[PDB]
């Protein structure tokens, strides 16, 4: 290496010399105005298509809260217009009516009664709407032991610490640890639309309402009933503690699986019943709802929802108008920039720079 | 008292000396972490996320995973660690070669030189160094091929010199020339302790049984290199790091940039808005958990414990919103500048063909400053001229002589002082005539041109002789004085011989003592002893330093030579002066002792011998003056015309005369024929005050038009500049220099070149650039911002201490206009985009506290958010920050007005910083309120009445966010290359494929159990594919319509150039 073949001349490739071929985009009026009229041309059929899909949805919402106070006990009085909401293809003649009913040992029940004015060919779904309930709270969304949901007999000292307030009561492992299970919505629905006056019943399905992964991961526990205790808010349905027969099966209990999926907003639906076999003929129906969950716990409301289904969820024109808003802004500036080009052009030379 | 024994390895091994190992590696496998962590955690972003991770380790506080921040911290830490380790590999690779070269050591057991390695060299081993190979250690010269034992070494590396030196050997040790007789040499070598003085040595060698004195003339440094002698026998004294090459270590200063300071202000801006977002949420939380204490009974809150609730909730929103300060920014901006320096130092237009010296950026932290330079502190000799000298004219005893009189001024009118030109033949006739009175003057003049200098001659096979002079004007005086009579033949220690081509005789002048030419001294002297027995002194230098040493008793050539210096400098010729003085032996007997004490002083030598040298230069008899030609470099008139057309002011700091710089300035298109020169040539401090006052008031008495301010130039010499730099007058000097388009300083001292640069930068806000060559403007380069060094004939002293080493001056027209405007515009947008992409996502975490009771719940997954700043949004910054060109390079030089864009700061400021920040807030709100209207009650799916949830909705937010972030970069880019299609559309397809794979495999390993069933409810839902089409267009319709408007009906300078570039 005495001579030292250095030759520090850099290569003449397009990369090292920054001579790579490229494309320079220019915003010429001939390359922008056709683009604005094109977006408006394709977003208008899609926009009017999504509002028609949301228009064909037929639903009915009955706020059954305040039924143990404002509803009658001896007869079916009309529900205040403040609560009922509905959308149907035909006009409704009879206003929905409700009546309170109590059973043995003080078991109240709200007996709603509505009218379906048209044959709904689409399948029927029934949710319940809970308002002002914050399931997206940081202390609440993570409060559940993921290993007990799988069915393992986790000891006390190995329990998840994310359920610290509700955990290891009276030196016994609370089996459904957490705030999500302890705060479960425990109202019961009739599971059948009792037809009234020349109308047959309409049975509803309770199975296959949760996610497919939930049924797979929620498995029957393997604890002993002499080493576990129910959560505090469940000491009414399971008094005297847990036994070999009272022990629930969380694999079949789909109402438990639907509740454990925390929602994103304080206004959320939860599926409970559905029917996809036959159509719903026109007539008058009745829904029995056991009143167990007080609205004083969360300060919100409780509703009874009966909807169908569409391509974009059910009855919502938020996505439909956005396609029309964007098509509207493009058509707006598409004409603004057009007349500005025809009347007052730039005429700022061509090759003469500003300096 | 260091004691060294010749040979006998068992004797000197007991002292415990070092080994010849060289290592410049900072990071080693023994103490890597104890110094790398202390260096990495010294910055702001790294220390901030260190405390964030330590805070995140408390229970029931972290809104995400416990290792979502320390995991990201280690990723950017090893990316910085691998680059800190690669540079140490190159340092270790370079140190391996210095320990791999060969070095033959005399082995007494073999009676011959046995080849070994440098690391095997021990103190006391006799080594044999061949020609053109460097010296391994500090070795004294014992013998060589020359009959006396001398050698010619090139002591570069440690210094910036390129010329040769001469080291002579003692007469006692020069006898041992044979290899076999080396075994008879024995004795002690008493030497000094390892020091750092490169020009001092006081050893003592006891050859055989009698001691002989040593001298610094018998010591070769490690960084030296043998040049002409065939072989040298050396005795090692200092080895390893104890040698004067590495023991005298150096330090490098750290320079901060303008963009670095603006970044520091933008970080404080984000840190303030961080505490605001934290306090807003922490206060809203503590008032809602107290007001609505009944409607939140299903949470089992603490209740009476609310003093610590604010502190625990303060830590929660600290960890949640800590992602607003991107840690990927500091590592990205460091690699962008490092990569841009690579693309700059690898260009053909910045490569010099005559000498293989490409542009190199030694400090890549100052690359963006090239697009915003306003002042240039240049230099004349070498920087503006080719620095190749040619003797053309002369003047002796008041008579001027040239070859071939041009035309008109042939005859001499003799109007007092002789004006005109003669022939060189008339000089010879006037010389050989013994009847003339000025004949001895001409003889003493010609002997001055070929004796007083310090040039080493070289003989070739063709019979000719070549002079290797350190200074290019030295070779002009030797060759100019030789091709007409007195030729310089051979040089040897303590002797200088010349040959008179007229009579054929040879004279031997005993070089008794010399004095080196210093750039501050501006004068060279050399005292000889003529063969007649007299001791005559010679001196030469500038007129501003010799005329102060003259006398008036017997000196009548002063008024004649002074007028000849005026007409020489008026043509652009580099002139000098000549003087002489005959000294006696009574005074030299004492002055010699003074010079010896000044040479062997351990205190200081760079200034001590300068004072002892002027002690003998009392009187001087001016003999005459010389004139040398020097032409400008190629393309320099075009670059200076273009640099001034871009709005850059050029200051020239020359150490030469005044009229020379003015003439070369008009030819260099720096000045003009209609430019009004404002000369300031004063003699006293009070005279400079009145001159500065008369300058400033005459300027403000009338308005300055465009044609008037453009035609101003300040010319101030060195003596006048020394007064105008005082604290009282520095304000008067600075206010008058800002009005003239060009400034020409003359006769400037080396240290005065730094005071001018420091005064302008400490009383202004503009960025300064200093370009020069040689050891006289090294302080000018270290004092400015962007220092540029030229590698010329003066050596390599200024090209190593600079930040950018350029072959010549022509390359500044592209290094600043093209590579400067690009580097500024690239790094500016890359940082503004890095702040926007990070705010457009993590701001949805703030609009969500209004929907979860101010709890601090994450909207997206813990690990999906960490991949945002690591995988999916780390390539668009690199493309737009390295491979982006907002205007063609062919048009960037045709219209130099574009340089004013970055010069003012039109691409990067705090006002524009807030524009990108509030643009992130706007896009953050569009995707937030847009999705909550579509996923109203979660009833947005069409799959047997099932509903989405918290995590199935956070994915739509995360996906729509990156489509708008990457969609923004599409409008920002100007050039669409192949690297762009991989970083902007390619990063999108990366996420559309990485998510179905990540969410279907990793939940099974207990990594992200929130994505167990989200793939079906998102990719399988027809609403997820419709929100990704309308929301990005709805949020980017503002930028698309605004870009069309500003380009069409409100264009700027480059908005019209980019249109001409497109359509032509
Ligand atoms: C039905 C409703 C539809 C809405 C549609 C609205 C349309 C107009 C909206 C606002 C109009 C206001 C201003 C727009 C009019 C003129 C803009 C001029 C000011 C401006 O350019 O600064 C911009 C910041 O941009 C915002 O800061 C953008 C800020 C916009 C402010 C809007 C309000 C934000 C306040 C925060 C909202 C928070 C809501 C909170 C909700 C809480 C929910 C709980 C800077 O980025 P830029 O990409 O444009 O930079 C330009 C651009 O790149 C290009 O033109 C140029 O290069 P070239 O020419 O060579 O390409 C380049 O040199 C540069 O000039
Ligand atoms: C449907 O869901 C409802 C809302 O969670 C739930 O209502 C709550 O039920 C729990 C369980 O009984 C109630 O908690 C008890 O409240 C009484 C006062 O009213 C307390 O005295 C009682 O503490 C007792 O303490 C004793 C001594 O320590 C102990 O021996 C007893 O076993 C018992 O623990 C409980 O704290 C709560 O007040 C109810 N209302 C609210 C707003 O939470 C319904 O029971 C539930 N229904 C069904 C059928 O599951
Ligand atoms: C969906 O609703 C239809 C309409 O009532 C149900 O069909 C009836 O089911 C009951 C249950 O045994 C039968 O006794 C009737 O004869 C059925 N009527 C007709 C016209 O088929 C159907 O079973 C429901 N599907 C469910 C609940 O899954
Ligand atoms: C279909 O609807 C009928 C009508 O309600 C259901 O029959 C009832 O079943 C419950 C459960 O055992 C009994 O308590 C009622 O007395 C039954 N009523 C009548 C009128 O038979 C029937 O169970 C439903 N089908 C299914 C599969 O549950
Ligand atoms: N070897 C030398 N000996 C004496 N004087 C010299 C020598 N070389 C140059 N000179 C003269 O002394 C001055 C030294 O100033 P200098 O820093 O070299 O200016 P420049 O930057 O133009 O090279 C020069 O202008 C010159 O007249
Ligand atoms: C349950 O049964 C007894 C205690 O009741 C004990 O031997 C056994 O280990 C317990 N656990 C299981 C899993 O059977
Ligand atoms: F022109 Al110079 F030092 F080379 F002032
Ligand atoms: Mg120079
Ligand atoms: Mg010089």
DSSP per-residue string spanning B341-360: HHHHTT-STTEETTTTEE-E
Cross-chain Cβ contact B1058/A208 below 8 Å: no
Ligand 6 centre from A213 Cα, in Å? Answer: 29
The torsion angles phi and psi of B621, rounded to 5 degrees, stand at -105, 110
Chain B residues in contact with A266 by the CB 8 A cut-off are 851
- CB distance B1056 to ligand 1 below 6 Å: no
Best mutation site among B818, B887, B1030 for testing chain A: the one with the most A CBs within 10 Å?
B1030
Say if strands B506-515 and B523-529 run parallel, antiparallel, or are unpaired: antiparallel
Ligand 9 centre from B776 Cα, in Å? Answer: 7
- CB distance A279 to ligand 3 below 6 Å: no
Cross-chain Cβ contact A314/B316 below 8 Å: no
Exposure string for A159-193, b = 16+ CB within 10 A, e = fewer: bbebbbebbeeeeebbbbbbbbbbbebebebbebb
Residue window 866-925, chain B: list those with CB within 8 Å of chain A: 883, 885, 889, 895, 897
Among residues B375, B64, B89, which one has the least CA distance to residue B55? B64
Give ∠ CA B447-B449-B454 in degrees, rounded to 5.
110
Cα–Cα distance, B3 to B15 (Å, whole number):
9
Number of H helices, E strands in chain B: 37, 31
Long-range contacts formed by B36-41: CB under 8 A, 24+ apart: B36/B81, B36/B84, B40/B77, B40/B80, B40/B81
Which helix (H) or strand (E) is B169 found in, with range?
Answer: none
Structure token digits, residue B155: 């002591």
Question: Which residue has 């190629």 as its token pair?
Answer: B634
Give ∠ CA A286-A292-A295 in degrees, rounded to 5.
100
Contact (CB, 8 A) for A10 and B351: yes
Structure token digits, residue B83: 């680059």
Q: What number does the ligand 6 atom closest to the CA of A224 have?
A: 1
Chain A residues in contact with B960 by the CB 8 A cut-off are none
Best mutation site among A138, A295, A311, A350 for testing chain B: the one with the most B CBs within 10 Å?
A138
Residue B74, number of CB atoms within 10 A of its CB: 13
Structure token digits, residue B203: 């050893």
- Rg of chain B in Å (alpha carbons): 38
Taken in order B301, B307, B310, B316, the sign of the CA dihedral is negative
Contacts of B784 by beta carbon, 8 Å cutoff, 6+ apart: B377, B757, B761, B768, B769, B770
Pocket test residue of A192, A194, A203, A204 for ligand 3, highest count of atoms within 8 A of CB: A203
B1022 is in an annotated binding site: no
Cα–Cα distance, B209 to B215 (Å, whole number):
19
Minimal-distance CA residue of chain B relative to A277? B944
Residue B840, number of CB atoms within 10 A of its CB: 26
The torsion angles phi and psi of B655, rounded to 5 degrees, stand at -90, 10
Solved how?
A: cryo-EM
Ligand 5 centre from B566 Cα, in Å? Answer: 17
Chain A residues in contact with B889 by the CB 8 A cut-off are 18
Contact (CB, 8 A) for A97 and A115: no
| A328 has a chain B CB within 8 A of its CB | no
Taken in order B212, B215, B221, B224, the sign of the CA dihedral is negative
Q: What number does the ligand 1 atom closest to the CA of B918 have?
A: 27
Structure token digits, residue B471: 């200074």
Structure token digits, residue B946: 């099932």
The torsion angles phi and psi of B159, rounded to 5 degrees, stand at -125, -175
Among residues B185, B205, B198, which one has the least CA distance to residue B108? B185
Among residues A287, A283, A147, which one has the least CA distance to residue A221? A147
Pocket test residue of B776, B778, B799 for ligand 7, highest count of atoms within 8 A of CB: B776
Ligand 5 centre from B654 Cα, in Å? Answer: 10
Contacts of B891 by beta carbon, 8 Å cutoff, 6+ apart: B1057, B1060, B1061
Exposure string for B776-788, b = 16+ CB within 10 A, e = fewer: bbbbbbbbbbbbb
Say if strands A192-193 and A202-203 run parallel, antiparallel, or are unpaired: antiparallel
Structure token digits, residue B797: 């002293």
Cross-chain Cβ contact B347/A299 below 8 Å: no
Question: Which residue has 């001027």 as its token pair?
Answer: B400
Which helix (H) or strand (E) is A121 found in, with range?
Answer: none
Reported in sequence order, the residue ranges of B860-982 that DSSP labels E, i.e. its strands, are none
Cα–Cα distance, A257 to A62 (Å, whole number):
25
Reported in sequence order, the residue ranges of chain A that DSSP labels E, i.e. its strands, are 59-62, 77-78, 84-87, 97-102, 108-116, 124-130, 173-174, 188-189, 192-193, 202-203, 228-229, 268-275, 283-290, 302-307
Cα–Cα distance, B819 to B349 (Å, whole number):
11
Question: After which residues does chain A become discontinuous at a C–N distance over 2.5 Å?
Answer: none
| A329 has a chain B CB within 8 A of its CB | yes
| A346 has a chain B CB within 8 A of its CB | yes
Contacts of B53 by beta carbon, 8 Å cutoff, 6+ apart: B69, B70, B73
Among residues B236, B229, B225, which one has the least CA distance to residue B168? B229
Contact (CB, 8 A) for B917 and B839: yes
Q: Measured between alpha carbons, how far is residue B254 from residues B251, B363, B783 in Å?
A: 10, 10, 11
Chain B residues in contact with A218 by the CB 8 A cut-off are none
Cα–Cα distance, A309 to A122 (Å, whole number):
8
Cα–Cα distance, B494 to B510 (Å, whole number):
6
Cα–Cα distance, B952 to B1023 (Å, whole number):
12
Contact (CB, 8 A) for B234 and B135: yes
Structure token digits, residue B732: 């008067």
Nearest to B1033 among A9, A267, A326 (CB): A326
Which helix (H) or strand (E) is B98 found in, with range?
Answer: helix B70-98
Question: Which residue has 């999504």 as its token pair?
Answer: A50
Cα–Cα distance, B340 to B821 (Å, whole number):
12
DSSP per-residue string spanning B766-815: S-EEEEE-STTSHHHHHHSSEEEEE-BTTBSHHHHSSSEEESSSTTHHHH
Cα–Cα distance, B458 to B338 (Å, whole number):
45
Question: Which residues place a Cβ less than 5 A from the ion ligand 8?
Answer: B 379, 381-382, 773-774
Cα–Cα distance, B522 to B983 (Å, whole number):
59
DSSP bridge pairs for B423 = B402
| B352 has a chain A CB within 8 A of its CB | no
Nearest to B934 among A136, A214, A318 (CB): A318
B125, B138, B313, B379: the catalytic one is B379
Structure token digits, residue A298: 């969360």
Q: Measured between alpha carbons, how far is residue B668 from residues B380, B483, B903, B956 in Å?
A: 11, 31, 24, 65
B359 is in an annotated binding site: no
Which helix (H) or strand (E) is B274 found in, with range?
Answer: helix B258-291
Among residues B75, B30, B524, which one has the least CA distance to residue B328? B75
Ligand 3 centre from A99 Cα, in Å? Answer: 27
CA–chain centroid gap for B994, Å, is: 45
Strand order across the beta sheet in which B523-529 lies: B399-401, B390-396, B621-629, B574-583, B535-541, B523-529, B506-515, B495-500, B486-492
Contact (CB, 8 A) for B513 and B428: no
| B666 has a chain A CB within 8 A of its CB | no
Task: Compute, in degrees rounded to 10, the torsion defined by CA atoms B981, B986, B988, B994.
Answer: 180
Cα–Cα distance, B459 to B480 (Å, whole number):
18
DSSP structure class, residue A303: E
DSSP bridge pairs for B234 = B127, B141
Question: Which residue has 């993570």 as its token pair?
Answer: A142
Say if strands B102-107 and B204-207 run parallel, antiparallel, or are unpaired: unpaired
- CB distance A207 to ligand 3 below 6 Å: no
Tell me the three-class secondary structure of B499-560, residue by residue.
Answer: EECCCCCEEEEEEEEEECCCCCCCEEEEEEECCCCCEEEEEEECHHHHCCCCCCCCCCCHHH
| B941 has a chain A CB within 8 A of its CB | yes
DSSP structure class, residue B871: I
The torsion angles phi and psi of B473, rounded to 5 degrees, stand at -80, -20
Taken in order A307, A313, A318, A323, the sign of the CA dihedral is negative
B379 is catalytic: yes
Ligand 9 centre from B779 Cα, in Å? Answer: 14
The torsion angles phi and psi of A208, rounded to 5 degrees, stand at 60, 55
Cα–Cα distance, B417 to B120 (Å, whole number):
71
Contact (CB, 8 A) for B835 and B869: no
Residue B799, number of CB atoms within 10 A of its CB: 24
Chain A residues in contact with B301 by the CB 8 A cut-off are 139
Among residues B723, B717, B721, B722, which one has the least CA distance to residue B686? B723
Minimal-distance CA residue of chain B relative to A333? B1041
Q: In 3-state terms, what secondary structure has residue B846?
A: helix
Exposure string for A204-224, b = 16+ CB within 10 A, e = fewer: beeeebbbeebeebbeebebe
Residue A315, number of CB atoms within 10 A of its CB: 20
Structure token digits, residue B299: 């949470």
- Terminal-residue alpha carbon distance, chain B: 79
- Terminal-residue alpha carbon distance, chain A: 56
Among residues B918, B1019, B1002, B1006, which one has the least CA distance to residue B959? B1019
Pocket test residue of A194, A203, A287 for ligand 4, highest count of atoms within 8 A of CB: A203
Contacts of B578 by beta carbon, 8 Å cutoff, 6+ apart: B445, B448, B538, B539, B540, B622, B623, B624, B625, B626
Question: Which residue has 């005399």 as its token pair?
Answer: B106
Cross-chain Cβ contact A262/B939 below 8 Å: no
Contact (CB, 8 A) for B330 and B43: yes
Nearest to A353 among B978, B1031, B1056 (CB): B1056
Contacts of A5 by beta carbon, 8 Å cutoff, 6+ apart: none
- Rg of chain A in Å (alpha carbons): 31
CA–chain centroid gap for B569, Å, is: 33
- CB distance A318 to ligand 3 below 6 Å: no
Question: Which residue has 């009546």 as its token pair?
Answer: A99
Minimal-distance CA residue of chain B relative to A46? B1026
Q: In 3-state terms, what secondary structure has residue B368?
A: helix
Cα–Cα distance, A51 to A319 (Å, whole number):
8
Half-sphere exposure of B433 (CA within 13 A, CB side): 10
DSSP structure class, residue B416: S
Cα–Cα distance, B920 to B903 (Å, whole number):
28
Q: Measured between alpha carbons, how far is residue A306 from residues A59, A62, A68, B441 in Å?
A: 6, 9, 21, 124
Closest C-alpha to ligand 5, atom 14: B522
Question: After which residues does chain B become discontinuous at a C–N distance over 2.5 Å?
Answer: none
Cα–Cα distance, B72 to B69 (Å, whole number):
5
B1042 is in an annotated binding site: yes
Give ∠ CA B1045-B1046-B1047 in degrees, rounded to 5.
90
Pocket (CB within 6 angstroms of ligand 6): A 153, 222, 224, 226
Contacts of A192 by beta carbon, 8 Å cutoff, 6+ apart: A201, A202, A203, A204
Cα–Cα distance, B441 to B624 (Å, whole number):
9
B747 is in an annotated binding site: yes
DSSP structure class, residue B462: T
- CB distance A107 to ligand 2 below 6 Å: no
Cα–Cα distance, B160 to B154 (Å, whole number):
10
Which helix (H) or strand (E) is B1000 found in, with range?
Answer: helix B985-1001
Say if strands B126-130 and B138-144 run parallel, antiparallel, or are unpaired: unpaired
**Domains in chain B, please, with CATH?**
2-21+99-242 (2.70.150.10), 374-385+635-815 (3.40.50.1000), 392-629 (3.40.1110.10), 832-1063 (no CATH)
């Amino acid at each position: 290496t005495k001579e030292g073949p250095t030759s520090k001349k850099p290569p003449n490739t397009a990369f090292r010399q920054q001579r790579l071929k490229a494309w320079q985009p220019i915003l010429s009026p001939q390359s922008v105005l056709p683009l604005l009229i094109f977006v408006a041309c394709i977003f208008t059929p899609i926009g009017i298509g999504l509002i028609v899909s949301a228009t064909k949805v037929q639903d009915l919402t009955i706020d059954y809260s305040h039924c143990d106070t404002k509803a009658s006990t001896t007869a079916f009085e009309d529900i205040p217009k403040k609560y009922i909401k509905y959308h149907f293809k035909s006009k409704v003649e009879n206003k929905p009516q409700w009546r309170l009913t109590e059973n043995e040992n003080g078991e109240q029940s709200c007996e709603l009664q509505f009218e379906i004015p048209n044959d709904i060919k689409k399948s029927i779904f029934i949710y319940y709407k809970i308002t002002n309930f914050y399931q997206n709270h940081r202390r609440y969304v993570q409060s559940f032991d993921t290993k007990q949901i799988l069915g393992e007999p986790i000891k006390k000292d190995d329990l998840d610490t994310s359920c610290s307030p509700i955990r290891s009561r009276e030196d016994k492992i609370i089996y459904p640890c957490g705030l999500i299970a302890n705060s479960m919505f425990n109202d019961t629905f009739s599971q059948v639309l009792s037809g009234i006056d020349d109308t047959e019943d309409y049975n509803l399905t309770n199975k296959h309402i949760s996610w497919s992964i939930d049924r797979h991961r929620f498995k029957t526990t393997k604890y002993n009933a002499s080493d576990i205790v129910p959560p505090p808010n469940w000491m009414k349905k399971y008094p005297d503690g847990y036994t070999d027969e009272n022990l629930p099966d969380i694999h079949t209990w789909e109402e438990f699986q639907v509740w454990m999926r925390t929602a994103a907003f304080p206004k959320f639906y939860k599926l409970t019943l559905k029917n996809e076999s036959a159509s719903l003929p026109k007539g008058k129906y009745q829904m029995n709802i056991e009143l167990n969950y007080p609205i004083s716990l969360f300060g919100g409301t409780k509703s009874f929802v009966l909807t169908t289904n569409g391509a974009i969820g059910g009855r919502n024109m938020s996505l439909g108008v956005l396609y029309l808003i964007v098509a509207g802004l493009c058509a707006l500036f598409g004409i603004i920039f057009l007349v500005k080009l025809i009347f007052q052009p730039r005429a700022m030379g061509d090759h003469t720079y500003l300096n | 008292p260091r004691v060294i024994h010749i040979n006998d390895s068992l004797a000197n091994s007991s002292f415990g000396y070092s080994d010849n190992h060289i290592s410049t590696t900072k990071y080693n496998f023994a103490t890597f972490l104890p110094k790398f962590l202390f260096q990495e955690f010294s910055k702001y972003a790294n220390l901030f996320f260190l405390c964030t991770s330590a805070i995140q380790q408390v229970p029931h506080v972290s809104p995400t995973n416990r290792y979502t921040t320390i995991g990201t911290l280690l990723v950017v830490l090893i990316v910085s660690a691998m680059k800190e380790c690669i540079e140490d590999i190159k340092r270790a690779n370079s140190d391996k070669e210095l320990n791999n070269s060969t070095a033959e050591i005399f082995s007494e057991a073999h009676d011959d030189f046995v080849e070994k390695r440098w690391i095997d060299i021990r103190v006391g081993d006799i080594i044999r160094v061949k020609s053109e190979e460097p010296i391994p250690a500090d070795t004294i010269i014992l013998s060589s091929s020359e009959p006396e034992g001398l050698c010619y070494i090139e002591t570069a590396n440690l210094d910036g010199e390129t010329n040769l030196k001469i080291k002579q050997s003692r007469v006692e040790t020069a006898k041992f020339i044979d290899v076999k007789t080396l075994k008879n040499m024995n004795g002690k070598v008493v030497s000094e302790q390892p020091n750092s003085s490169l020009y001092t040595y006081e050893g003592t060698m006891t050859l055989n049984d009698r001691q002989i004195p040593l001298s610094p003339d018998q010591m070769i440094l490690r960084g030296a290199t043998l040049r002409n002698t065939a072989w040298i026998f050396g005795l090692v004294i200092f080895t390893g790091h104890e040698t004067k090459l590495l023991r005298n270590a150096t330090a490098t200063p750290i320079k901060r940039t303008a963009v670095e300071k603006i970044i520091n202000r933008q970080i404080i801006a984000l840190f303030t808005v961080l505490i605001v977002l934290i306090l807003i949420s922490s206060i809203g939380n503590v008032i809602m958990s107290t007001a609505d204490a009944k409607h939140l009974s299903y949470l089992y809150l603490e209740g009476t414990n609310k003093a610590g609730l604010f502190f625990k909730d303060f830590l929660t929103f600290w960890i949640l919103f800590s992602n607003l300060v991107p840690i990927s920014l500091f590592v990205t901006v460091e690699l962008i500048k490092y990569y841009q320096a690579f693309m700059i130092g690898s260009d053909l237009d910045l490569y010099y063909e005559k000498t293989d010296t490409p542009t190199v950026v030694r400090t890549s932290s100052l690359v963006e400053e090239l697009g915003q330079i306003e002042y240039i502190f240049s230099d004349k000799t070498g920087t503006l001229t080719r620095n190749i000298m040619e003797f053309k004219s002369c003047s002796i005893a008041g008579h001027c002589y040239i070859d071939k009189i041009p035309e008109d001024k042939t005859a001499t009118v003799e109007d007092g002082i002789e004006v005109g030109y003669r022939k060189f033949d008339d000089l010879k006739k006037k010389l050989n005539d013994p009847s003339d009175e000025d004949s001895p003057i001409i003889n003493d003049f010609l002997t001055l041109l070929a004796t007083c200098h310090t040039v080493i001659p070289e003989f070739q096979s063709d019979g000719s002789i070549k002079y290797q002079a350190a200074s290019p004007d030295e070779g002009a005086l030797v060759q100019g004085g030789a091709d007409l009579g007195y030729k310089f033949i051979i040089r040897k220690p303590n002797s200088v011989t010349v040959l008179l081509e007229e009579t054929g005789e040879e004279k031997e002048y005993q070089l008794l003592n010399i004095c080196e030419f210093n750039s501050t001294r501006k004068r060279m002297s050399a005292i000889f002893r003529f063969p007649d027995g007299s001791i005559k002194l010679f001196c030469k230098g500038a007129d501003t330093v010799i005329l102060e040493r003259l006398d008036d008793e017997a000196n009548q050539y002063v008024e004649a030579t002074m007028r000849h210096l005026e007409d020489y400098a008026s043509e652009g010729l580099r002139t000098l002066c000549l003087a002489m003085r005959d000294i006696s032996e009574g005074e030299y007997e004492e002055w010699n002792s003074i010079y010896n004490e000044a040479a062997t002083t351990l205190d200081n030598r760079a200034e001590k011998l300068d004072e002892a040298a002027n002690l003998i230069e009392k009187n001087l008899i001016l003999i005459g003056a010389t004139a040398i030609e020097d032409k400008l470099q190629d393309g320099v008139p075009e670059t200076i015309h273009t640099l001034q057309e871009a709005g850059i002011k050029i200051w020239v700091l020359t150490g030469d005369r005044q009229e020379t710089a003015i003439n070369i300035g008009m030819s260099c298109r720096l000045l003009s024929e209609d430019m009004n020169l404002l000369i300031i040539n004063e003699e006293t401090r009070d005279d400079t005050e009145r001159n500065l006052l008369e300058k400033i008031n005459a300027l403000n008495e009338h308005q300055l038009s465009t044609h008037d301010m453009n035609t101003l130039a300040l010319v101030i010499d060195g003596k006048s500049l020394g007064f105008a730099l005082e604290p009282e007058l520095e304000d008067y000097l600075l206010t008058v220099a800002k009005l003239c388009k060009a400034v020409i300083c003359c006769r400037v001292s080396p240290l005065q070149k730094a005071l001018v640069v420091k005064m302008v930068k400490r009383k202004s806000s503009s960025l300064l650039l200093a370009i020069g060559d040689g050891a006289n403007d090294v302080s000018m380069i270290q004092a400015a911002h962007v220092g540029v060094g030229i590698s010329g004939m003066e050596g390599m002293q200024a090209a190593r201490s600079a930040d950018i080493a350029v072959g010549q001056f022509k390359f500044l027209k592209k290094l600043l206009l093209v590579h400067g405007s690009w580097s500024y515009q690239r790094i500016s947008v890359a940082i503004l985009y890095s702040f926007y992409k990070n705010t457009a996502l993590y701001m949805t975490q703030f609009w969500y506290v209004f929907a979860n009771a101010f709890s601090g719940q994450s909207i997206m997954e813990s690990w999906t958010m960490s991949f945002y700043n690591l995988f999916f949004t780390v390539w668009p910054p690199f493309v737009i920050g390295v491979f982006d060109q907002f205007v063609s390079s062919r048009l960037l030089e045709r219209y130099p007005q574009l340089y004013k864009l970055g010069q003012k700061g039109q691409f990067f400021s705090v006002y524009i910083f807030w524009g990108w920040i509030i643009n992130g807030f706007f896009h953050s709100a569009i995707v937030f309120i847009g999705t909550i209207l579509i996923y109203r009650y979660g009833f947005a799916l069409n799959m047997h009445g099932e509903l989405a949830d918290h995590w199935s909705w956070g994915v739509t937010v995360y996906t729509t966010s990156v489509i708008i972030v990457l969609g923004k970069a599409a409008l920002v880019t100007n050039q669409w290359t192949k690297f762009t299609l991989i970083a902007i559309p390619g990063s999108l397809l990366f996420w559309l494929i990485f998510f179905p794979i990540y969410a279907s495999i990793f939940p099974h390993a207990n990594i992200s159990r929130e994505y167990y069933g989200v793939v079906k409810h998102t990719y399988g839902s027809g609403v997820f594919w419709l929100t990704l089409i309308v929301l990005p267009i709805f949020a980017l319709v503002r930028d698309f319509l605004w870009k069309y408007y500003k380009r069409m009906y409100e264009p700027e300078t480059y908005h019209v150039i980019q249109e001409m570039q497109k359509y032509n």
